[PDB]
Subunit: 215 residues, 4 copies
């Protein structure tokens, strides 16, 4: 697959929509405000459209390395704020994945250059849950660190002024923390779903509980 | 489409892969370093996998509002640096789209809150090409502003220390500026493709030329 | 001057305040909300307290390389927002300086590494005012580029959602663009002072006018 | 103190340098690369020149709200990188202060708007040292949280790719964590001084030890 290839395939794909689905065109222009925001990893091993079944333009998308929501990341925050305040998305989904190359680089910690700074946000979390991970077998640790990372970005997100003020306003917005692996492509809801500031706290704690309970 | 729905569809989608394509699983785990980085808009009216035909994990993805590459955006830059220096992607693609909601909000300029700051980076460009746009008909202006925005983010990207140092190192990396609309889903190469620092300049100018030539 | 030196001098400085000015202590604790925000360059060849005469804690301070106010710089913006919305500063001052090492590095353009990305925000401005600079003698260009940079950060600042919403709210806040050199330490008001959205535009244009008028 | 006032005082201050210190001018132009970087709080209750005794232009300065060094803060990082790689500063100093308005707002947690996001980086630390603070009296907690914040930004800073790569290169750079209050203006070295990656770890731990030892 080189460039002339994708250009060629595009043209033909576009022609053949006429016989497969012309309305694919017309579903998009009518309406189409998306109802969901998806925050994912740039690894994007499986595309959210395919995972979920959603048509495109029911979705609004942010993808950074390891699907982080840093407190002061104006890029990601700008996506969220537009999504919540302007497109009035009903749900937001942070999806991680087992085998995440950036979760991995945080842990193994090679000298990769500029990215290592971004990954320090992951090592912070790994530290934060040291004890928890200590009490479980090493085989299960990396993947648990994926689940913890999602869960923490869910926590971060509900703490943003954007979400705080939206919930207090009476806007109906729910946050989710999912993960999947490429062994099956099967979603695992991490149980951190947050419909307000109270449930954000409860369910943050609940889910950390269930990792510290099961292990 | 509510949440229980996507969870349900996911499970069934995942089961049915066994009969449609079990290898979908095994193509991913072997290898799979992606060869392409895609920078797009969070609007994501058409997913890059579908536009292009690429399998997932031939792609690495960044999506922000109006597919900007701001000089000092550590989020987007962190994606690029990992992509170029660590995954050694061969190509990078910045894809815009006609009807881009954020290109639109820059122009019409409503009070949307936090996002307006991000969109100031677009109004800067619109100003920069005032004369050029002045010499063409108003019907063609918004869409031309999409093309200009892509083209400028291509210019920005080749100016990043990351790209500058990669090209000087002898790494083989090419930048593209595409756009598409949902009228047909058909890609338009904007002709700004840059294989080094010399071609970045030539083709930046070349493409601005062809807008100022055709109009 | 090594470390033991500053620690030693500090102790003695602190003791000797008793005889020079004990109230220096008590002016600070009462009140002291500052009335001015100062955005400067990290070069800080002359400290704002000394330039201006202000007591400390009449001032609130941000210093980055070449005193930029980037649209999406959450650090600088966070300073401004707290200053304007919480401390209710009455004035904000962006001060540049002739001989600014970072204005210089933008122009001469050496490979310095990470910083070069930040300085691209300066080369953008230098481009924006190419014609203007072209019509004047080269001897006067670098220093004029300092004045232009200040002036543009003043323009940027009044365009921030923070300032836009503050002015529309009825809050009384004025923006200034100053510069000085170390030949005399003498301030030059660049005439871009902005008490609202209307005066921001007028005086942006006014001052660019006077550079394009005088030259 | 209004604007005409500072302009007037400036002019007169500048004239009167001739009789107080004309060389103040000529010390600056010769050389003057600074040997120290100072990272402080925008509160800037006491200016570093006065605290320390340093002449201006022995210093290079960054001031944000509560003197944070966030992993992904390109503004602050850009200052550090230029300072360390280009000006070859020998020392870097992070100075906090007791009574810090932003440390305070993190704790009390009022709805101040945009700034609250920046302050989440402080509440993270406060959490991180919950136990430690729990074992001491409440009267001593806020001020201890200042010391912890400095100490953590010192830790963050030595973890930046910039510092990591500089130390490994053989560059001679030392990090300090100081604090002061306006009761006396007296510096307290927090004992986190780091001359390399090994001493960064030792002394991070050492200093946390001495808070957990003394209390
Ligand atoms: Zn990943
Ligand atoms: Zn768009
Ligand atoms: Zn400077
Ligand atoms: Zn403070």
């Amino acid at each position: 697959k080189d460039i002339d290839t994708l250009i060629s395939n595009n043209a033909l794909w576009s022609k053949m929509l006429v016989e497969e689905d012309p309305g694919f065109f017309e579903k998009l222009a009518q309406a189409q405000k998306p109802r969901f925001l998806w925050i994912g990893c740039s690894d994007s091993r499986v595309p959210a459209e395919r995972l979920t079944g959603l048509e495109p333009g029911e979705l609004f998308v942010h993808r950074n390395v390891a699907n982080l929501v840093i407190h002061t990341d104006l890029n990601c925050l700008s996506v969220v704020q537009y999504a919540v305040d302007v497109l009035e998305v009903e749900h937001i989904i942070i999806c991680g994945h087992y085998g995440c190359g950036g979760v991995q680089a945080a842990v193994e910690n090679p000298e990769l250059g500029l990215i290592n700074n971004w990954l320090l946000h992951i090592r912070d979390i790994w530290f934060k849950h040291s004890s928890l991970l200590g009490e479980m077998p090493q085989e299960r640790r990396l993947d648990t660190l994926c689940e913890l990372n999602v869960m923490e970005q869910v926590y971060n997100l509900g703490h943003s002024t954007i979400m705080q003020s939206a919930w207090k306003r009476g806007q109906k917005v729910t946050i989710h923390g999912w993960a999947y692996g490429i062994h099956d492509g099967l979603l695992r809801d991490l149980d951190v779903t947050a419909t307000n500031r109270e449930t954000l706290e409860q369910r943050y704690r609940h889910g950390i509980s269930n990792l510290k309970l099961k292990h």
